[PDB]
Amino acid sequence: TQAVEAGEKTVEQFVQALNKGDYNKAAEMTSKKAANKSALSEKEILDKYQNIYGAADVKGLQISNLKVDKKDDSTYSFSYKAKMNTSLGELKDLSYKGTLDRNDGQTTINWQPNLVFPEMEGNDKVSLTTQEAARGNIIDRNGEPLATTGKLKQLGVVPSKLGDGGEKTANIKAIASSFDLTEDAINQAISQSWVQPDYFVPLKIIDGATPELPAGATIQEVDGRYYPLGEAAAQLIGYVGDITAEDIDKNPELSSNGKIGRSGLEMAFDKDLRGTTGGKLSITDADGVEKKVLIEHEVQNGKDIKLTIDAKAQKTAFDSLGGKAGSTVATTPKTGDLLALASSPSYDPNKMTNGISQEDYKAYEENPEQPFISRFATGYAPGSTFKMITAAIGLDNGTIDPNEVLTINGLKWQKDSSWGSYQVTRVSDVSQVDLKTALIYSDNIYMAQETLKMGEKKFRIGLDKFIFGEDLDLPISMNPAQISNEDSFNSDILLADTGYGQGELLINPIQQAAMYSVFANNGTLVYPKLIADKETKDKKNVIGETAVQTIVPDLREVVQDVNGTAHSLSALGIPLAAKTGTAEIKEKQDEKGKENSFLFAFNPDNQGYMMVSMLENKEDDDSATKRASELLQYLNQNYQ
Numbered sequence: 289t290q291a292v293e294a295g296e297k298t299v300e301q302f303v304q305a306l307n308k309g310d311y312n313k314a315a316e317m318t319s320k321k322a323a324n325k326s327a328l329s330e331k332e333i334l335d336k337y338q339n340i341y342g343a344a345d346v347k348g349l350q351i352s353n354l355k356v357d358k359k360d361d362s363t364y365s366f367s368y369k370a371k372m373n374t375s376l377g378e379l380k381d382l383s384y385k386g387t388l389d390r391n392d393g394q395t396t397i398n399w400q401p402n403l404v405f406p407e408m409e410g411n412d413k414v415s416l417t418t419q420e421a422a423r424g425n426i427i428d429r430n431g432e433p434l435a436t437t438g439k440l441k442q443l444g445v446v447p448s449k450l451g452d453g454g455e456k457t458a459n460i461k462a463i464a465s466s467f468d469l470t471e472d473a474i475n476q477a478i479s480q481s482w483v484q485p486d487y488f489v490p491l492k493i494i495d496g497a498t499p500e501l502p503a504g505a506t507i508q509e510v511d512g513r514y515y516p517l518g519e520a521a522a523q524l525i526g527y528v529g530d531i532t533a534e535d536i537d538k539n540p541e542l543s544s545n546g547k548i549g550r551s552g553l554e555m556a557f558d559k560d561l562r563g564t565t566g567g568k569l570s571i572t573d574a575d576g577v578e579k580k581v582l583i584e585h586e587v588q589n590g591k592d593i594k595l596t597i598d599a600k601a602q603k604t605a606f607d608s609l610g611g612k613a614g615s616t617v618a619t620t621p622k623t624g625d626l627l628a629l630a631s632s633p634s635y636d637p638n639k640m641t642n643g644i645s646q647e648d649y650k651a652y653e654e655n656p657e658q659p660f661i662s663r664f665a666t667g668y669a670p671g672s673t674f675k676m677i678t679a680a681i682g683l684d685n686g687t688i689d690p691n692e693v694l695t696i697n698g699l700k701w702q703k704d705s706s707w708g709s710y711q712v713t714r715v716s717d718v719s720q721v722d723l724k725t726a727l728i729y730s731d732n733i734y735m736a737q738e739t740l741k742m743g744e745k746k747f748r749i750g751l752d753k754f755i756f757g758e759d760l761d762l763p764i765s766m767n768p769a770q771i772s773n774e775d776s777f778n779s780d781i782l783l784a785d786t787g788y789g790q791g792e793l794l795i796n797p798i799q800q801a802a803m804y805s806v807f808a809n810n811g812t813l814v815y816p817k818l819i820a821d822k823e824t825k826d827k828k829n830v831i832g833e834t835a836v837q838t839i840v841p842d843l844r845e846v847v848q849d850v851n852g853t854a855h856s857l858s859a860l861g862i863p864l865a866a867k868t869g870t871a872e873i874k875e876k877q878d879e880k881g882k883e884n885s886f887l888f889a890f891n892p893d894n895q896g897y898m899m900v901s902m903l904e905n906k907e908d909d910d911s912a913t914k915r916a917s918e919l920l921q922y923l924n925q926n927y928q
């Protein structure tokens with residue numbers, strides 16, 4: 289029995305080499321090719337495993353219940369159960385047999401064909417048939433398509449039917465001007481190594497009406513992924529790309545001929561959208577007659593996925609950004625339905641999934657405005673909109689008297705001389721400032737003084753009631769919002785700067801809409817929701833209902849008062865409660881400071897909608913407030 293455990297070592301090493309993909313090392317562990325030993329030579333074992341297991345994409349061989357006994361003086365039979373993963377799913381409970389051999393001191397395996405699959409007999413063969421699964425669709429809250437599959441018109445040229453000289457140059461220029469293409473692009477496409485003169489060289493996926501086709505230009509219909517909104521929802525939806533051999537090596541249940549989501553919801557929901565491949569993996573005898581069916585099941589097309597997004601609101605929010613750096617989040621704050629998740633600038637997902645140029649992708653990747661960023665999921669300093677939270681906390685703990693009038697002289701203020709040359713600044717030199725005036729003019733000095741009077745302890749008690757440090761249950765990659773880098777400010781300056789939303793605060797636009805939902809639910813925070821069929825989740829008693837009834841009327845004056853920072857929104861004539869903001873960041877590139885514009889707004893009458901828009905590294909005189917009129921009209925009209 290001292291050699292039985294040595295044989296179990298070799299059997300465990302044999303299945304480990306098969307599991308590791310090292311078919312040569314597993315073939316070295318066999319004995320001699322005889323009549324009652326190995327049924328094939330060593331190099332022939334490498335080929336049989338590499339051909340069969342490679343055809344079925346066998347990966348992850350796991351064994352169980354190993355029993356090594358004694359049959360003769362030189363024969364030690366063994367048996368075990370095993371399972372493996374193939375391109376058609378998991379192949380379970382496979383009963384393997386065989387024998388072992390040990391002549392001198394080394395123990396080897398008597399290789400037999402049944403060590404590839406249980407029922408193999410000599411010249412038996414393996415067949416695999418597969419059928420691709422159609423990818424599921426991504427639809428909005430009203431069934432409108434966001435990521436679907438349709439017929440695409442592919443433009444291409446046959447180098448033979450172009451010409452020989454001069455006529456070929458003229459026909460290239462005719463196609464170049466008829467479809468907005470570079471003459472260097474056509475000549476570089478038809479001059480690649482794969483191009484034959486009679487081949488169809490694809491050029492561009494045209495989306496509009498088909499123009500007049502010059503000589504050599506033909507258009508073929510191909511089926512592929514299509515995004516009706518395009519740039520307007522590229523960061524959220526994402527794109528699909530060709531599946532590589534490395535993707536198959538990681539997950540053999542993928543379709544080697546299909547597409548895989550590379551970013552956005554296409555990647556986050558890739559398993560539900562891609563479905564399962566159908567087909568049959570069978571063993572045949574030498575005659576090709578089906579012997580045993582190992583795996584067989586029919587194709588299951590991918591599921592559709594309905595989002596809370598409004599396709600009309602998504603396009604309106606994105607176009608309102610005018611192609612500048614920024615983002616916009618629109619919700620129904622009583623339920624959390626994310627109506628829009630726009631990010632700008634953006635990339636073309638249709639061009640991305642239909643083959644993109646190396647320089648076109650380089651332009652996206654090296655654009656300093658970085659269109660690949662999902663800005664609705666990137667943490668920012670919230671700015672002056674965060675004063676709503678600081679005021680609500682000060683009202684709940686009794687620190688802020690809504691009618692107490694602070695006397696503030698000038699535009700700069702500091703606690704005492706220990707602050708050095710640093711001072712909190714404001715923009716409006718208003719002498720008599722209470723809570724309402726502080727919100728109308730957005731007074732940092734008022735909030736900084738109220739935050740310092742409140743103290744870090746009471747401030748964090750109110751802050752910890754929100755969603756700082758929480759992972760939102762959303763299919764979007766994001767980091768939790770943070771109050772500061774550490775659990776303590778350890779600085780009166782940092783405490784005051786946090787008071788008006790300008791410390792180490794990092795809150796992405798989606799998390800901001802979650803925190804700000806308390807002003808539309810009487811102090812109840814409603815978590816955002818992207819999947820339509822999801823259940824509404826909320827947190828009770830985040831802030832007091834009294835604070836809501838005090839701040840929201842003041843937020844109406846931010847729009848209605850003639851000196852309110854959002855007074856331009858009064859032109860709409862709709863019930864609006866808003867709060868603006870402008871944060872300052874230090875971008876060491878140009879060294880001159882950069883500014884982020886912010887806007888929070890919702891309907892205080894029906895609580896039907898709520899939006900949080902922002903501009904990153906805004907241009908002078910540009911703001912989110914001057915861009916929200918069109919989106920506010922649509923949300924007020926359709927969401928009450």
Ligand SMILES: *C(=O)[C@@H](NC(=O)Cc1ccccc1)[C@@H]1N[C@@H](C(=O)O)C(C)(C)S1
Binds near residue numbers: 713
């Ligand atoms: C909140 O964001 C506040 N911002 C500042 O104090 C910084 C700042 C940035 C640019 C110019 C001047 C001051 C206040 N709220 C913003 C706003 O609501 O847009 C103001 C610019 C009114 S100051």
